[PDB]
Design a binder for this molecule. Structure first.
Ligand SMILES: Nc1ccn([C@H]2C[C@H](O)[C@@H](COP(=O)(O)NP(=O)(O)OP(=O)(O)O)O2)c(=O)n1
Ligand SMILES: [Mg+2]
Ligand SMILES: [Mg+2]
Length: 430
DNA sequence: ATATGACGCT
DNA sequence: AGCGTCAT
């Protein structure tokens, strides 16, 4: 009734860079612009593994994780850029630096939560309120929203995409109740205006295009973002949720893409997000737990409370490399030399981090994977990180894992290791 | 034989 | 502390 909270208290956006690693390489190398192209790492095995794909190459069926040799069969004109390789491993510094370019521009507009190397959530609630007094009941021109889609519109009584976009926007803006400064729909619209400006600034100042979702929480914003990629933004209002969720496969909602989402489908015998509404909160808690049940009950009604955390810096700094198949490390010397390669890159990045961001890591986490174990980590151990010194860090890492070696011979390492992973954590101000 | 990062559970 | 889930 009147006491039902509707999850319309915030304006939250999720910005995601379109094929981000490709854009970085394309800005640097104009010959790659506006062409089917992909970013590859390690040219030797099958041409290297593809980790980013331009939208031109996506039209041929090229995808992430594909071998480049196989992508060329689908797309013979595919152009490739290689990831930097340092100390025998992929080095992502160029993309980290490009990411900082984007995050700093976004930070001028509102509070940012860095969600990945190329995505950030944005809490626009405060900026919207401020803009609502500076605007003074002025109606919002469609010209302030030139790349915005209104999910669910047009409805009711044009055969080209831009024509549909405009008609839905016009239908949205004509219905808009501008005098009520507390209309959630008006707030979202103002949020979208600000995101148009933020996205124009990113493009003007870096050359990078991105997509965005604008809604009332993080889950809807993230979902909204992908509805109209690339170089577009989508507003998902509270009212759009029943129709949108009615055919929305459960696995598309953030955090339901894995085992939990699969057991929702199997235990309840449903396919789409909106079908969750027919169960009571207690029923959902009995099947999935107190916290998963509460979360699902509200989320299938468009409601979610996870805050945009004010954090632009990662909380851990990590270095890892896999050694698949025949390349698995099988002698003590190999294990030690690779720990040293990881420790050396880690020291470089930590020292950079200590000068840029006034903090030091205090704990080193060492993670390995053993041959035949299909888990991400076979084993995790920690030690103190007191000195940004690569030889000390690699030696201590070796110390805390060496007893895992079941080999009778000193030369050897068994079982062979298919991953080494060094992660600096537990930062303190400095 | 596809490098990372955030976080929950116990 | 150490392992498990989910994600880009
Ligand atoms: N599994 C993954 C996913 C992404 N990435 C990297 C490469 C991507 O350019 C970058 C951004 O990830 P992403 O947003 O999921 N995809 P990308 O930005 O390339 O394309 P879009 O679909 O977002 O337009 O992280 C990775 O290295 N391994
Ligand atoms: Mg992206
Ligand atoms: Mg992303």
């Amino acid at each position: 009734g009147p006491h039902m909270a509707t999850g319309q208290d915030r304006v939250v956006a999720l910005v995601d860079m379109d094929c981000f690693f490709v854009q970085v390489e394309q800005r640097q190398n104009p010959h790659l612009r506006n062409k089917p192209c992909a970013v590859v790492q390690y040219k030797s095995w099958k041409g290297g593994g593809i980790i980013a794909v331009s939208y031109e190459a996506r039209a041929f069926g090229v995808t992430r994780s594909m071998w480049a040799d196989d992508a060329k069969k689908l797309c013979p004109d595919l152009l490739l850029a290689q990831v930097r390789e340092s100390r025998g491993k992929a080095n992502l510094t160029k993309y980290r630096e490009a990411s900082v370019e984007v995050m700093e521009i976004m930070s001028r507009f509102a509070v940012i939560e860095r969600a990945s190397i190329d995505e950030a959530y944005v809490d626009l609630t405060s900026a919207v309120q401020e803009r609502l007094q500076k605007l003074q009941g002025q109606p919002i021109s469609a010209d302030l929203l030139p790349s915005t889609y209104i999910e669910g519109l047009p409805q009711g009584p044009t055969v080209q995409k831009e024509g549909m976009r405009k008609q839905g926007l016009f239908q949205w803006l004509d219905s808009l109740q501008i005098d009520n400064l507390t209309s959630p729909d008006l707030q979202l619209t103002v949020g979208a205006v600000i995101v148009e400006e933020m996205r124009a600034a990113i493009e003007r100042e870096t050359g990078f295009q991105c997509s965005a979702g604008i809604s009332h929480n993080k889950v809807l914003a993230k979902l909204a973002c992908g509805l109209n990629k690339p170089n577009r933004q989508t507003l998902v209002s509270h009212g759009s949720v029943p129709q949108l969720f009615s055919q929305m496969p459960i696995r598309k909602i953030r955090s339901l893409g894995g085992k939990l989402g699969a057991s929702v489908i199997e235990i309840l015998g449903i396919e789409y997000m909106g079908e969750l509404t027919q169960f009571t909160e207690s029923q959902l808690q009995s099947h999935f737990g107190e916290k998963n049940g509460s979360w699902l009950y509200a989320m299938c009604r468009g409601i979610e409370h996870d805050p945009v955390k004010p954090r632009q810096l990662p909380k851990t700094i990590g270095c890892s490399k896999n050694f698949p198949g025949k390349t698995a490390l099988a002698t003590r010397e190999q294990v030690q030399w690779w720990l040293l390669q990881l420790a050396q890159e880690l020291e470089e990045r930590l020292t950079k981090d200590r000068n840029d961001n006034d903090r030091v890591a205090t704990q080193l986490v060492v993670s390995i994977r053993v041959q035949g174990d299909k888990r991400l980590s076979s084993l995790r151990r920690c030690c103190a990180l007191t000195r940004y010194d690569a030889h000390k860090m690699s030696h201590d890492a070796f110390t805390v894992i060496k007893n895992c070696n079941t080999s009778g011979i000193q030369t050897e390492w068994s079982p062979p290791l298919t991953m080494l992973f060094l992660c600096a954590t537990k930062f303190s101000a400095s």
